[PDB]
Amino acid sequence: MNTNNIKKYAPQARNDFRDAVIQKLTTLGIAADKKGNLQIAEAETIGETVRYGQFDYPLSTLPRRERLVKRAREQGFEVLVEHCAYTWFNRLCAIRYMELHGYLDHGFRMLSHPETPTAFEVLDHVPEVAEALLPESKAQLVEMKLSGNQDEALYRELLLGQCHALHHAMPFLFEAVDDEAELLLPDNLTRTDSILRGLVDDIPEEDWEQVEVIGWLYQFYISEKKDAVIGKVVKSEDIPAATQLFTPNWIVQYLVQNSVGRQWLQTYPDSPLKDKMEYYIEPAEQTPEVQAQLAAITPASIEPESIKVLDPACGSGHILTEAYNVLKAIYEERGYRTRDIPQLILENNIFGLDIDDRAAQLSGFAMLMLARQDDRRILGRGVRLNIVSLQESKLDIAEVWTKLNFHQHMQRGSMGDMFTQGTALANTDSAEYKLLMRTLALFTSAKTLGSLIQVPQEDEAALKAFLERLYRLAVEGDIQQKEAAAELIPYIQQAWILAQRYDAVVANPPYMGGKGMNGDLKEFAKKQFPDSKSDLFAMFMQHAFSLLKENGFNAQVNMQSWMFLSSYEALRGWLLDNKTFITMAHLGARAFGQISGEVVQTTAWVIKNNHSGFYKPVFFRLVDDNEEHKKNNLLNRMNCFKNTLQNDFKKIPGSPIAYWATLAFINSFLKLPALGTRAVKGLDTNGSIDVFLRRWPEVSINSFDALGKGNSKWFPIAKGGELRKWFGNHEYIINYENDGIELRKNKANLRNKDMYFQEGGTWTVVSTTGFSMRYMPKGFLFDQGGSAVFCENNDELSIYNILACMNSKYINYSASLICPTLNFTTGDVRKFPVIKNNHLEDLAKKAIEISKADWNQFETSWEFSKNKLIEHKGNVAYSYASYCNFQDKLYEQLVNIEKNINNIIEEILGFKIETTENSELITLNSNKIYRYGQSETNDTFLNRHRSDTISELISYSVGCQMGRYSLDREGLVYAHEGNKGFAELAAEGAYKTFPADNDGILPLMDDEWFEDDVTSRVKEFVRTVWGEEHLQENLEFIAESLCLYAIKPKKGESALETIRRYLSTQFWKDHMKMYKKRPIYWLFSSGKEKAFECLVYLHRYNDATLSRMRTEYVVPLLARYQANIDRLNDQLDEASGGEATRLKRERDSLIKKFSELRSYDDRLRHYADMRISIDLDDGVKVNYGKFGDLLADVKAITGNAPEAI
DNA sequence: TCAGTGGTAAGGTCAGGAATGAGTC
DNA sequence: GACTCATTCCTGACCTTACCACTGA
Ligand SMILES: C[S@@+](CC[C@H](N)C(=O)[O-])C[C@H]1O[C@@H](n2cnc3c(N)ncnc32)[C@H](O)[C@@H]1O
Ligand SMILES: [Mg+2]
């Protein structure tokens, strides 16, 4: 990938530059403690030399550092560090870009040397470069070049001279003299460990051929900080870090060509510009009244130097570059000279605002480079750009005015204002000037609000005049006047930019919801934007219309939420009664490459500033694809809708923008009863989801309400889950003992308490695969993600009819139309239509029974009874065939039932509906398509299904060995705590056919040394179940099925060898996958070598388990290893040659196993000395980290690395 | 002002084949 | 001069859960 190099390099470059700046600041006596407090040292001046603690500098540097100290007090230390770091990074990147394109006058490279790695070409042409840059002191430099030493100082002087020369062209990025940042430039630039080496030889020089590279830098420099700050409340200083992305080029072209190009083409329909714009959309045919209305406002002529384009959040300047291209085409069409166009465009067409200085620097550099591509003599003229960063007003009020001395030069310096001094307009009045006071009062919190600040248009022209005077006082004034003007210019310039009215506003606004916005921004939004205070992009969308003149265009790409969510309903009304929709492309998710996830789902629109309710917009539906496919579809004008008036959006209550809905569906939807207040929201813990919720297998069943009797601490809860219909997702339990006293002590939100333990339906709030509802029996609670539906005391609708309706294709389509924003909130579900019928109830009952039968066939459900294979006593292959037939019968029955339901629904409405995503999917584990996903072809999961079935059989056998299950009775047998009551169960005869282990420790060895070896007991289980006569073929079938998918086949081995290899290699991972990182059989392993491994049943563990494990399993194993090692030593001397080679090579393995087992035995003795007791109520996650490194995969389960004694 | 219910998110995890790289033989 | 395993390397698919926000008494 082209962007991989920059993506890897940029954050590391940020870290390196920050470290260098911090070190340089510490050398200057400026530092911050752990808490962040300033630690400015005291400067001691002796022998015309300043000292800051231990370090010393010449006296000449004393004043400059003082300014840095001021910047350390008026702003934070971290702000100063970040600013200096990215300033130097941007300067170096700009120099590199200009040297790779030959834009430097001397024509030699600065940061590198062609065809010579780790060299600088500038040092080979010192006289020429010195004459070009430092004519007054070239000879001395030559002398330095003659010295042979002190090359670092020479290179530093040359680089600083290059920067000072570049100051004139780009005042926004380079300084000229008395620059504080020169003190922070790192030394040892020419060495092999400098910051320049990474920049030079970490990015290929072929990546600098286009301006686009700049944009990538703009995104990749700050990615780590974005990851650090995202997800919580964002401070004002961190606002840019969370909202800085790079917009794809085709989206920008679509936005620009349909706003500026459209304005040009309206006046000049027959112009050679439409052929140069690939993304220009032809308007649909309109009624004669609409055409007559439009023709009455179109001007008869447009002057090219009158089109004003503004980017309220310029960022890297991509939108400005595309606008520049379009305007250059327009100027060339009008017939201007080629080399004069760029200056005109940059001086009277392009305007840009940003809240971050880095973005302003990058945008200015990008615009200048794009102009330089066309004009050779540019960068030598005083081109003044109108792309700025907003500055917060904190300077003094009257001191700057006194320094300015306006009356001395022209007039209005003592009391002359826009009005008389004594008028005292509004509250700001005129302490020095009416206009100046009013302007400065508006930017007291600029670094938080940005471009949302409103400036009256009536003050525009006056401001302009004032600005002009400043432009003359910075060139034709004394020192005080020059510095006062240089201080005042940015505020007046930003005010004038905000006070102007524009033909088009094109932007990609920041996205930030209610959680991320801080208090000041939130209260400002509440006061100023009542209809769009819930998000930042909505505020930008509403504020952009106030910056437009009449008949202007607003073109933006933002979140799709405002199209559908209720929080923006009022906003939509305000849009449908005052504005005109021109065009829209709905992009959905997977747009904006280099961004992952489905939170960001976007739409790009162009809207006019006038009102016409009978206009027909053009819509494109580009939701379901990736970025390249979306671009190709947009280029081919695919998925177009042009048959809906703008007023027609107001027929549906709430006025959603549902452009792709059909008229018949709308008519059916309007005249149909809704679900109503039957749907309610579930409970929610305050911040303790991991304290009160468990998975069912990891607690005792005596305290489980669904299984136990009397006392109940744990209750089943519906929490959502993946797509599943009519039954399932019964996997979570909550602590609700004594009516949730512990929950009430935690200030939990127990919503709708009176509906608990009732039967009803439940759906998943957060989903991206479609809508589904499942039956919920009595004795259940429901979470906020598992919101529920309940029937009234006596209503005409039963719960089964509602379930039948909600799982049909009609409701699926309607839910897709109503809730396309990743959430199915209760208020949106409350308006789903419901249909009353009689057959639907029995059809839903049959579907629920089938789904329950499908769900209860695995160990993961607490209603599991027994393994399905062992019910047939004929043969293992015969049992597998019967199992497959049973699953097929279930699948066919459910298919028929759903088909009948859909037919009944369709014959009532009177029309057929289009199939939607997973509209006909059957959500059963008996269906391989649902279980293993969709492949390119069918009949490709037979081997995987067979392997999974055999693995489940082996897991059931292990569970029978542990005593969890039995062959004499169905369901769970022993799931209590601390091995209490197991002796009574064993004495009663619950394991008569297949006895259980006497202590709950199963050695997972690689030999038949132990009598309770797992492989031998699996063989015994197979013999007991399917008889003795056909044992060998059953074992062969099991081994072949395991080798099909679970493990790789081996050249030569028997069935038992394959079983042992699977048990020692794959069983643990399968168990962890099945129980989802909450195991009930814990694996104790010695290490990378299988010296000793065992399985312990969690429910049979007690404080005497480790001692028994050490005594009965580890010490005899050590004795056996010692005896075996002693045996091999005797045979080595007797044998010789190649005969003894195998003995020698196996003795080393035996020695390694013995040493590892001794270390593990020492650790086990230490941990067994402390009698460790665990409470199952604490959960597997907490209890799994109490044994150090004795357990396997501690980090994957607990989440943190195991500790060492 | 506090109860009692609803709303929303420039994201976060995870299975699952392709590289990548140290032991064997 | 290949084999054989144990780590990354994305890559596409899928659902949070905490903390606001909005009425009634
Ligand atoms: C995603 S960038 C878009 C830049 C440009 N469209 C591009 O693709 O390069 C959004 C920018 O808006 C800026 N921004 C955030 N909040 C702002 C505010 N309140 N006022 C003005 N600009 C703001 C951020 O600094 C950020 O750089
Ligand atoms: Mg045992």
Residue numbers in the entry: 1 to 1205
Direct quotes from the study:
Anti-phage systems of the BREX (BacteRiophage EXclusion) superfamily rely on site-specific epigenetic DNA methylation to discriminate between the host and invading DNA. We demonstrate that in Type I BREX systems, defense and methylation require BREX site DNA binding by the BrxX (PglX) methyltransferase employing S-adenosyl methionine as a cofactor. We show that BrxX contains MTD and TRD homologous to those of Type IIL R-M enzymes, and, in addition, contains NTD, CTD, and insertion loop in the MTD specific to BrxX proteins. We show that BrxX alone does not methylate DNA, and BREX activity requires an assembly of a supramolecular BrxBCXZ immune complex.
However, when BrxX was incubated with a 43 bp dsDNA fragment containing two BREX sites in a head-to-tail (H2T) arrangement (DNA H2T) in the presence of SAM, a DNA-bound complex accounted for the majority of 2D class averages. Single-particle analysis of 11,152 movie dataset demonstrated the formation of a 1:1 complex (BrxX:DNA) that was highly homogenous despite the presence of two BREX sites. Only the first (from the 5′-end) binding site was occupied, suggesting that a stretch of DNA downstream of a BREX site is essential for BrxX binding. The DNA-bound BrxX is a bi-lobed Pacman-like monomer consisting of four domains. The fifth adenine of the GGTAAG sequence is rotated out of the DNA backbone together with its deoxyribose moiety and the neighboring phosphodiester groups and is nestled in the active site of the MTD. The TRD contributes to the recognition of the first four base pairs of the recognition sequence. Our analysis identified a critical loop (residues 587–601) in E. coli BrxX MTD that confers specificity to the recognition of the final base pair of the BREX site. The superposition of the two structures makes it clear that it is the “upper jaw” of the BrxX monomer that closes around the DNA upon recognition as the MTD moves 19.7° between the open and closed states (left).
